[PDB]
């Protein structure tokens, strides 16, 4: 758990995962509910509001527009190289 982000209800949350640069690697964002938002450039959750902001070998960044209180929780970014590293980002949503 390396980061905690506070965002206000109704604004845009940006989740940026920047890692070491490794050949033949993958990057992935997971929701608190444990489902894939993107694996590399490929979306998984469908009909969703998540937007791909940037994908390259050492960066996967996504936008969570129009944040609701239920978008709170621990999101995870996984980096698949010789081993799998995980960054955990706790999102706090402020009401009002």
């Amino acid at each position: 758990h390396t980061e905690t982000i506070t965002v206000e209800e109704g604004q845009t949350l940006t989740l940026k995962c920047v890692t070491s640069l490794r050949k033949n690697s993958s990057l992935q964002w997971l929701t608190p509910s444990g489902f894939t938002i993107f694996l590399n450039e490929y979306p998984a959750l469908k009909n969703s509001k998540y937007q791909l902001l940037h994908h390259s070998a050492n960066q996967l960044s996504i936008t969570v527009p129009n944040v609701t209180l239920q978008d709170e929780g621990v999101y995870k970014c996984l980096h698949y190289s010789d081993s799998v590293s995980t960054k955990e980002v706790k999102v706090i949503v402020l009401a009002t």
């Binding site: 033949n24 993958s26 992935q28 997971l30 444990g34 489902f35 894939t36 694996l39 590399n40 490929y42 998984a44 959750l45 469908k46 009909n47 996984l78 698949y80 190289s81 010789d82 081993s83 799998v84």
Partner: protein, 100 residues
């Protein structure tokens, strides 16, 4: 629920076959995760650098994977995910028995 799987018992050192089945498929993404919820297969793509995993079959209705030279460290819940809206999840438990 449209997504199903089945528990697996395997002798240590042998080959486990793990399958995620979809009834009445609409071609939503099928994913298989390991016990640490790391992706083994996303459709036919394997991001996980463990060449003991191989793809046995991939279709609209099935993602079937083998794990060769299973060890006790591989024991546990493997998660099938189906990206319908809302998505579904069903896990299979892999039990590893002592070798001969």
């Amino acid at each position: 629920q449209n997504l199903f799987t089945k528990d697996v018992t395997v002798i240590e050192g042998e080959v486990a076959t793990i399958s995620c089945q979809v009834n009445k498929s609409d071609d939503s993404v099928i994913q298989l995760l390991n016990p640490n919820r790391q992706t083994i297969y996303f459709r036919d793509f394997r991001p996980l650098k463990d060449s003991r995993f191989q793809l046995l079959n991939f279709s609209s209705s099935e993602l079937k994977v083998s794990l060769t030279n299973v060890s006790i460290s591989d024991e546990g819940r493997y998660f099938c995910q189906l990206y319908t809206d809302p998505p579904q999840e069903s896990y299979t438990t892999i039990t590893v028995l002592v070798p001969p």
